[PDB]
Amino acid sequence: HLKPFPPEFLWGAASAAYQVEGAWNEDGKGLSVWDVFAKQPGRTFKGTNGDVAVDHYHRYQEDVALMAEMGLKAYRFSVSWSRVFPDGNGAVNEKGLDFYDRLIEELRNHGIEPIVTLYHWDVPQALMDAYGAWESRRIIDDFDRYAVTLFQRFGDRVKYWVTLNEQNIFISFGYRLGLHPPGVKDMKRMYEANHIANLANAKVIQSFRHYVPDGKIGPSFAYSPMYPYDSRPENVLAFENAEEFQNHWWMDVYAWGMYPQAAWNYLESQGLEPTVAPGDWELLQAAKPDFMGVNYYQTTTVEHNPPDGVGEGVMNTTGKKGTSTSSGIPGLFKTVRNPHVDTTNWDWAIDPVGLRIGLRRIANRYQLPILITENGLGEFDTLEPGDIVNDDYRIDYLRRHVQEIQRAITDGVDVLGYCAWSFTDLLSWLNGYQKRYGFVYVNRDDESEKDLRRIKKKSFYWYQRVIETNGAEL
Amino acid sequence: HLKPFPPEFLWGAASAAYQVEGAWNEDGKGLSVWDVFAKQPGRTFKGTNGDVAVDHYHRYQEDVALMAEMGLKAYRFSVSWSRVFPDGNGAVNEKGLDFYDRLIEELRNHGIEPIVTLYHWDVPQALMDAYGAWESRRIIDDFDRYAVTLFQRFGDRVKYWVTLNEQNIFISFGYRLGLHPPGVKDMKRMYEANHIANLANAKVIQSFRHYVPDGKIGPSFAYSPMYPYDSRPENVLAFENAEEFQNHWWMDVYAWGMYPQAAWNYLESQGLEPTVAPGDWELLQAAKPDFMGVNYYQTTTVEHNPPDGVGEGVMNTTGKKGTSTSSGIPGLFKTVRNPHVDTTNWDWAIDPVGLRIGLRRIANRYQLPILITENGLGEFDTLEPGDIVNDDYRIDYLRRHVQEIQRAITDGVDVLGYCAWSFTDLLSWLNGYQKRYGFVYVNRDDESEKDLRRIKKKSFYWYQRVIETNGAEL
Ligand SMILES: O=P(O)(O)OC[C@H]1O[C@@H](O)[C@H](O)[C@@H](O)[C@H]1O
Ligand SMILES: O=P(O)(O)OC[C@H]1O[C@@H](O)[C@H](O)[C@@H](O)[C@H]1O
């Protein structure tokens, strides 16, 4: 006997500002780091960018009407920092606040609960220009200022907030792999920026306790649960190293205010540990979140890796299956293909049991409620004559993950809600428009902008059915 | 770049009263549950019992002189509760207290640190007869009276104390597997007795803070870290289930005062959860220990197990290799042979890297210091002419574990000490005398006490060197 989904379970879907909004220079909006970065040659798939994206800024009324038709209980979206503070720092742009106020109003008028992500990777370029953005403690005061603005403005209508979206991704990709702005490959700077982001997250959770006393806040972590390749002790040890370095390094800070000691000692042995200042620990430890947000797509299997072994690997940005290669930390661990799971055309593992495992690990270790703020299947879709998108692959992916969530709930994990990625098709940062996640197909590709018309996929109706029955029918 | 062992690392060896002391009915000692149990036909190997054991009660001065020759920094022994309270909870037997006083004085006169185990499985039979011993909350006050008696008599001279030795073993063997007294096979009774023992542990730690304010105290957990068989998600899930039901069930209570939720919910779904009285949680949560005591011998590899699958397995008590069979909890997990590790003649896995993994898991999850209270190799030994015992297999085993401990210390695990099991050969509860662990061979077997003479094994001189060089020389 499975527990039922709780009565007010947030059946949701999600987007991110730069990926959907467009209107990149309208109504006072300032330059963001992604405005700049995406226009640099070779940074994105086929030079795609979010100048227009899917034009959600102008079509939000249509999109919300499709959410209402779907029956969504919740919609997760991010506020574009550069829309609200074009300089990051100076005067509020009221036109920018007015759009999100219009959007929230529309959501509530249709009975949809808004989930607002404060930061989804688009720090204003002015802050990067002024002081290096996440590499400077000044961004703590500046990020706080921007969040308190949003708290005061919308605290009365938005109950659920996410602080930083996938801090582990935009810090690592932006400062170690050089695939995100600022395009740096410097492990020392990476950990300094990561430590500052940790302090920013804690500071605004504290501010949230004052300005929105009845609300619920937490970060959203990009969680890939690690697996050992097999029962060889050296591979299990590699799994221990990988889970602590890739996952506990962030989630222990979110939940306990402390870095894990083995990873710290390893970084300290190389001078790579972050600069701690007086008060940092007191701040980090005095900022408990209401939940752990989890973005989940896949697990990662690892094995032992010699000190001279694999480092950076190839990542599949083209959808040509089988082109990614193993990556790792020399001496600690390396990724390896898990022969027991299928993979997508971008080589992502399809592992719905991995989601239950991951939910269990977080409940077991931190004792916190979980909001699944992203989960979904990115794949090619074909538009058929008659406005038919038969995305059975995506229905099956989502069905199996939702089934594992109910088993995790039965196991005692307190799951607050589930936000599928994504509501409409949107621009994938590094993969372009062909890597589609939406319940709603958007009519454009990487060559032609066409008309951006929305078309309901087969998965739209499946998920509408799920929400209708509170998950009882999948 | 290995860290050295700390200057005052407690290089130790260990015993347990019933396995070593003999003198089972001398100087006013009462019956323990093991005096009665081992004299029941069929309960022990070839009917062996601890009536004489290796006669340490009369020979302790010889044995301590050998410890000083070895240069032991610490000696871990248990107090026989039935020596001190012949009927468990009446008047104190002063001759019983006088033996441990003479032993402790003998240790301290040779510069050896006493490490006292309050409970190593031998609750007096009178308490079993009166109210069922660990199945009654009456044992909480009776164990507290006995602990405080020792705290007051010896607290000036003993700083390191262990409360319950391997609660997970004596409770599950005594109440689920029927292999220890009282010989019960009842899962409901097992979890009730286990909960009472948790309360008795917390209560004595509370008392300890009052009577030995400068001392250090902890339980000693029988830790077998779990491995998944491979990266199949269902086997990783079995591993999550195993680590939670076999390990977190006890260690979360010791460290955090809380049972893990997924295991609790599974027990509750069957009416197997223990009876919780008001005040239980407050007591369990207000008894933090100074260290986690870790008894380590081997890892366990697990895979998925259907609801009709494996339950109880065969355990090797004869030293005939390849006689153990798989065990598990149907629906949750089953053990499986780990093809990457060697095994002893009793089918115990030899996995020194598993100790490093186990130490890392405890440090990472609980941030506690660890005292390794047992580790060693039980094997056949041959006495050759000239009183020579060349146990290079034991040296090899111990050397590799001590090396993995040093690597764990380098990772940042705070390891207080290392007690090898055992100082002299002694009675193995279920395996008789032929399964030897000692640094010191004792001349006797299952059929004759012979002369009980002590003979230093090759490993004696190896450990002596280890201690002399503080582990620099392994
Ligand atoms: O677009 P991708 O690379 O396929 O990832 C899919 C999604 O999951 C996370 O990475 C991000 O929070 C989203 O913004 C989105 O990018
Ligand atoms: O004697 P065995 O079964 O080989 O195990 C060796 C040791 O195991 C631990 O569980 C006990 O604390 C010791 O008393 C000793 O028995």
Task: Count CA atoms within 13 Å of residue A99 on its CB side.
Answer: 24
**Which of B427, B423, B410, B444 has the alpha carbon at shortest distance from B71?**
B423
**Which of A157, A408, A256, A237 has the alpha carbon at shortest distance from B359?**
A237
Query: How is residue A111 written in tokens?
Result: 């009975």
**Which of B205, B248, B192, B202 has the alpha carbon at shortest distance from B225?**
B248
Q: Indicate which residue's Cα is closest to atom 1 of ligand 1.
A: A428
Rounded CA-CA distance B32/A279 in Å is 56
* Range A315-320 contact pairs with CB under 8 angstroms and sequence separation of 24 or more: A315/A179, A315/A430, A316/A346, A316/A347, A317/A45, A317/A346, A317/A430, A317/A431, A318/A45, A318/A346, A318/A431, A319/A345, A319/A346, A319/A380, A319/A431, A319/A434, A319/A435, A320/A345
**Closest partner residue to A353 among B237, B338, B361, by Cβ?**
B237
B167, B173, B428: residue to mutate for ligand 2 pocket, most atoms within 8 A of CB? B428
> In a 3-state reduction of DSSP, which class is residue A372?
strand
Contacts A354 to B, Cβ<8 Å:
233, 236
> Nearest residue of B to residue A262 by CA position?
B411
Do the annotations mark residue A250 as ligand-binding? Answer: no
Query: How is residue A343 written in tokens?
Result: 């993979």
The bridge status of strand B454-456 relative to strand B440-442 is: antiparallel
| Residue B376 CA, closest ligand 2 atom number | 6
A353 and B230 within 8 Å at the Cβ level: the answer is no
Rounded CA-CA distance A94/A378 in Å is 35
Ligand 2 center–CA B399 separation, angstroms = 20
Set B374, B379, B404, B473: catalytic member = B374
Cis peptide before B15 (omega within 30 of 0): no
How many other CB atoms are there within 10 angstroms of residue A455's CB atom?
Answer: 18
Q: Residue A336's beta-bridge partner residues?
A: A301
Note if A312 is an active site residue: no
B244 and A364 within 8 Å at the Cβ level: the answer is yes
- Is B165 a pocket residue for ligand 2 (Cβ < 6 Å)? yes
Ligand 1 center–CA B329 separation, angstroms = 39
Q: Which helix (H) or strand (E) holds B163?
A: strand B160-165
DSSP letters, B408-453, are HHHTT--EEEEEEE-SB---BTTTBSSSB--SEEES--SS--TT--
Rounded CA-CA distance A262/A254 in Å is 17
Query: How is residue B196 written in tokens?
Result: 């009472």
Rounded CA-CA distance B295/B359 in Å is 11
Rounded CA-CA distance A194/A267 in Å is 13
Radius of gyration of chain B (CA): 21
> In a 3-state reduction of DSSP, which class is residue A296?
coil
E strands, A342-414, in order: 342-343, 349-350, 370-374
φ and ψ at B350, to 5 degrees? -105, 110
Residue B121 per-residue DSSP state: S
What structural domains and CATH numbers belong to chain B? Answer: 1-474 (3.20.20.80)
**Closest partner residue to B231 among A244, A338, A361, by Cβ?**
A338
Locate tokens 């829309």: which residue? A83
Rounded CA-CA distance B456/B386 in Å is 12
B412 and A248 within 8 Å at the Cβ level: the answer is no
Residue pair A283/A203 in contact by the 8 Å Cβ criterion: yes
Query: How is residue A86 written in tokens?
Result: 């074009």
Contacts A364 to B, Cβ<8 Å:
240, 244, 248, 260-262
Set A374, A404, A447, A449: catalytic member = A374
The nearest CA of chain B is from the CA of A126 a distance in Å of 40
Q: How many residues does chain B have?
A: 474
> Nearest residue of A to residue B338 by CA position?
A231
**Which of B257, B296, B293 has the alpha carbon at shortest distance from B370?**
B293
For helices B138-154 and B187-211, angle between their N-to-C axes, nearest 10 degrees: 30
B231 and A340 within 8 Å at the Cβ level: the answer is yes
**Which of A123, A121, A126, A118 has the alpha carbon at shortest distance from A87?**
A126
How many other CB atoms are there within 10 angstroms of residue B66's CB atom?
Answer: 18
The bridge status of strand A415-421 relative to strand A370-374 is: parallel
The nearest CA of chain B is from the CA of A2 a distance in Å of 11
Query: How is residue B156 written in tokens?
Result: 């000036």
Q: Is B336 left (phi over 0), alpha (psi -120 to 50) or beta?
A: beta
DSSP letters, B226-271, are EEESBS-HHHHHHHHHHIIIIIIHHHHHHHHS---HHHHHHHHTTT
**Helix spans in A8-49 (H):** 17-20, 33-39
Burial string for B316-331 (b: 16+ CB within 10 Å, else e) reads: bbebeeeebebbbbee
DSSP letters, B308-373, are TS--S-----S--TT-----EETTTEEEE--TTSEE-TT--EE-HHHHHHHHHHHHHHH---EEEE
Residue pair B231/B241 in contact by the 8 Å Cβ criterion: no
| Residue B19 CA, closest ligand 2 atom number | 14
Q: Residue B281's beta-bridge partner residues?
A: none
A264 and B412 within 8 Å at the Cβ level: the answer is yes
Q: Which ligand is nearest to the CA of B224?
A: 2
First and final CA of chain A: distance in angstroms? 16
Residue A244 per-residue DSSP state: I
DSSP letters, B371-401, are EEEE----B----BTTTB---HHHHHHHHHH
